[PDB]
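## Example record

The block below lists the input lines for one assembly entry, exactly as stored, with component labels intact.
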Amino acid sequence: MRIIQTTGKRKTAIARAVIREGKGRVRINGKPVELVEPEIARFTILEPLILAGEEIWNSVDIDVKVQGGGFMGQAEAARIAIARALVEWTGDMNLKEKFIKYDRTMLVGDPRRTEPHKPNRSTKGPRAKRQKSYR
Amino acid sequence: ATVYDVPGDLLVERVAQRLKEIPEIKPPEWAPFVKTGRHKERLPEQEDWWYYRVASILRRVYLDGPVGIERLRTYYGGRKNRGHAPERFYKAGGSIIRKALQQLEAAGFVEKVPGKGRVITPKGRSFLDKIATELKKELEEIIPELKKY
Amino acid sequence: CRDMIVLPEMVGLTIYVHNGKEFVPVEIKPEMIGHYLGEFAPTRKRVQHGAPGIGATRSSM
Amino acid sequence: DFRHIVRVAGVDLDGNKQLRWALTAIKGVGINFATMVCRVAGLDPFMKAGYLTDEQVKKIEEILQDPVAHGIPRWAVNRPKDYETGRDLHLITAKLDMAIREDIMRLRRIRAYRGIRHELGLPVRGQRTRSNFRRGQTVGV
Amino acid sequence: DEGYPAEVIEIIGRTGTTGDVTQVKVRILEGRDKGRVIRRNVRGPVRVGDILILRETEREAREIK
Amino acid sequence: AKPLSERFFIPHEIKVMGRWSTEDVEVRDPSLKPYINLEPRLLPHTHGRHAKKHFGKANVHIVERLINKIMRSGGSHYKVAGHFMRREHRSLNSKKVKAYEVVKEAFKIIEKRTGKNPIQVLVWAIENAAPREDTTSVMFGGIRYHVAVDISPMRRLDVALRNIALGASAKCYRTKMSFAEALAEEIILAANKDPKSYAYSKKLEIERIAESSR
Amino acid sequence: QKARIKLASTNVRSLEEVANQIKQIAERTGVRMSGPIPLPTKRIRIVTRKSPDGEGSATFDRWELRIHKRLIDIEADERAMRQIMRIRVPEDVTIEIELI
RNA sequence: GUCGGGCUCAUAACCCGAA
RNA sequence: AGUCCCUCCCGCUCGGGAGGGAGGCACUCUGGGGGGACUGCCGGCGAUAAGCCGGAGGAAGGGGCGGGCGACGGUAGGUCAGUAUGCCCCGAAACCCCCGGGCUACACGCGCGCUACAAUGGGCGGGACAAUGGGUGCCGACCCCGAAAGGGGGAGGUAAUCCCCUAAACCCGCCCUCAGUUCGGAUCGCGGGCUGCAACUCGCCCGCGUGAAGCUGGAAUCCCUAGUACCCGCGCGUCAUCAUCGCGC
Ligand SMILES: [Mg+2]
Ligand SMILES: [Mg+2]
Ligand SMILES: [Mg+2]
Ligand SMILES: [Mg+2]
Ligand SMILES: [Mg+2]
Ligand SMILES: [Mg+2]
Ligand SMILES: [Mg+2]
Ligand SMILES: [Mg+2]
Ligand SMILES: [Mg+2]
Ligand SMILES: [Mg+2]
Ligand SMILES: [Mg+2]
Ligand SMILES: [Mg+2]
Ligand SMILES: [Mg+2]
Ligand SMILES: [Mg+2]
Ligand SMILES: [Mg+2]
Ligand SMILES: [Mg+2]
Ligand SMILES: [Mg+2]
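Predicted structure tokens for the full assembly:
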């Protein structure tokens, strides 16, 4: 009974995924992945499964728990977790080489974070400033 | 099949239609005349909005119980247009929510946990999950990917 | 006492309400019931404007 | 059956509009109050105004004559606790205008601060007047 | 009517009032002077291996310092 | 309204938005070919990772470039067809989901109206809207003069995309037409060289001014 | 039959020293001692305008005070409780002992 | 010609709007 | 998360879910210590120096990214109305308290913003996903009453334990269809509340009614190079009550 765990992060969202042999069921916080909305979020999660192919997809079950961030941050973190779990579970280098070509961030992640805000119109952002007048 | 397996809005619609058969669910006498909160502008446009609100509250108790009036008031609030001032968030009122919870308890679907709020009874869980099963059966005729679940 | 509320027993009397520098006379009528006394003793003088001075416009400075 | 113009309480109403929005052409009746009166009359707020009958128009005029006695709550009328009689009243058109004029005149007769603000045409609800509320032409130096 | 394509082979330098122009050497690929190398002034980012569509091939830019 | 089969759509192949393949799409102009990216890809959303590196935008799929182009207000500090179009609190700045849906609906309308693959029609439009000659400014005696120059292919592509977006923006401003319909109309008109297209007319005007200043 | 020890300080080194001494005492005897658990640091940030007057560009100071914390569990045995009760922490350290 | 606003450290010249 | 027990649901149970308890520190997280990047490796330009340009590998590549720390001086720049201080003045008032006013006035010129002029929308019902901070002169779950604002009781919390705290922009369905309108919400009438010793001058909130200018802006002119700008809400300061502001998320 194999159980494999993986982790993914994207701008304060954190996702933990578990994978084992199954029938093709993928749930996100208890919901089937086929019913995630909006469509742009749904396609974000589904890309690694489509890349892997129908044979591999239908032979496993994946459960993902994700918290923090927003609806686009959570989709990308789950995508990273699923891709890492798929490369570790099947252990073949053609699929891993396929992920790096299509999207490197799938396996290496994204380190970007918000820049802290500064005085002169602090609430708007680090660089935006008040309009300047001379008379 | 459970509540977790179907889209929320479609389930609320089906449950609202099925709730009209329970004699213990009846709109109050002031229902024709009120708004649902200080952040709204106009009255509800559906003549049968009471049943939709009751069904939404029941599904909310199912998913997040035990839960009380104040937190539900947070959930049903929203953004308000304030004329020349910027928009802001505000809570909803309490009379609608409290009356809906009392009616649901009268029907036996929810019950009171002391100092903690209200929770779904086995009868209410069966009532919701049966309708969810029926909706999922119809749903997977046109989305074959939902048969595996 | 500018914050005193006018009551029905005060109707018919005359009361001198301070406005900052002088006591001004107020005669209580029945339709005054429920209003503060200060509402009938203005504290500011009506404005009658004169000619704008030097610096009142960009080209006058 | 269909009429393009229907007169209700002495106002010509559009016949192609929904009843709830058509009723707002009356001064004294906004959308919320109009929906309330449509619901009390037992009429669909979304039906076209041009399908009304004579008995329905009579019933609407009766409701507008005395809404409180027909089941509309006392907190929904535009003149609760009338200054003269003390009842909860609702007014439309000329009566509404004359009641407002009487209120302002009563303020002016006792020489209250608000009445003086009304007379001089200046803001009455505590606003600052140095910067905004300018209506005129520039003075020269 | 459809211009003549030319391939950039060397970058010379920046010019223009605000530095917005680049001078290059190009080789004509089609037409009467196919094979001729001429220098031209270009607006926009450009690198070795790009292809321009000249509407005529008889004007040559003045050599810059 | 929208059928449930379209609300919950599950694709199984790698193609643009799970609905259109670009295998038969051809690019006729030899200068624009290495800069119009058509490599197979399902979701056109790269999260702005290309702008940091020089010439990075070359390897960005053309549909995502179009989506990025429409995610804007339109008329901030210059006039389009005689007007500023300042939309502010009701613009599409930073709302990528709505722009994505606009592009999707425009593609469906295009395919229904012409019977061809929408990507091909878009390619034809950008080919017809890309200028070949422009001008640079000089100053003498307090008078401004034009001098004709050539245009690099990346700038040609950027200008064509910008003008297509601006034409669509102008066609839906304070009129009964919707944004998706206006975009489909602008693309179709530019594909056929109709002077009713904003981008094609702009393209002709730029070339005329460049020609008369050699 | 277990005692809970809470520690707090503005200095990391002293806090570490006290925890290590308690750990040595718990090692010197047959007794299990749950390791020192680090609780989140408390941060006190105050932002102030720099100039005494109001002329010139506005500029600000961001002053910070940091208070570190630890938690230690041990089983209340008198042979071990006497040694820990006779330890003296530096004056810049708060120590609180309770029995649960 | 009158009044108001731009440009300038400021004034003159210059630009814009209005009656 | 995997594992054991108990209870309740579903297509009646081969299978799929949800609570509670035993149990564990795996995973997330918290915070002490350590590793990692050096123009180190490769190819060019320059001199064979200083360096520069382009590649690999890499979480990260050329002050890696964002901040704190501002030399000798000048500016008779600002501040004696934060506190310290020389001289000159008042010293039965220019010192000390109490009451009522004023700083909130209004033909008009200007700065910085907010809300709009609508479909790249307005309304009505339904569905989603945060982080920073703060709490005993206080934060208050949970129950009851009220149409709303609010009112009556009150668990837990001196806090990784309890609370503020189920954000909005976004998505689904229906009405409106280019109109000064179902756009906009200034202005005003009547009524209901809260804080406070006091609400007229001169506070904030809620219900019904009322419905001004505005249909994209001359000459000019501002901010910004990446998780940046735009768009969206939220926390803290001030604070009895009061945020179109400041500092942050
Ligand atoms: Mg930011
Ligand atoms: Mg909502
Ligand atoms: Mg608005
Ligand atoms: Mg706003
Ligand atoms: Mg001058
Ligand atoms: Mg640095
Ligand atoms: Mg000086
Ligand atoms: Mg000065
Ligand atoms: Mg002042
Ligand atoms: Mg409106
Ligand atoms: Mg809504
Ligand atoms: Mg109107
Ligand atoms: Mg009043
Ligand atoms: Mg007042
Ligand atoms: Mg007008
Ligand atoms: Mg218009
Ligand atoms: Mg201030």
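The helical segments of chain D are 19-22, 31-40, 54-65, 94-109, 113-120. The longest helix of chain D spans residues 94-109.
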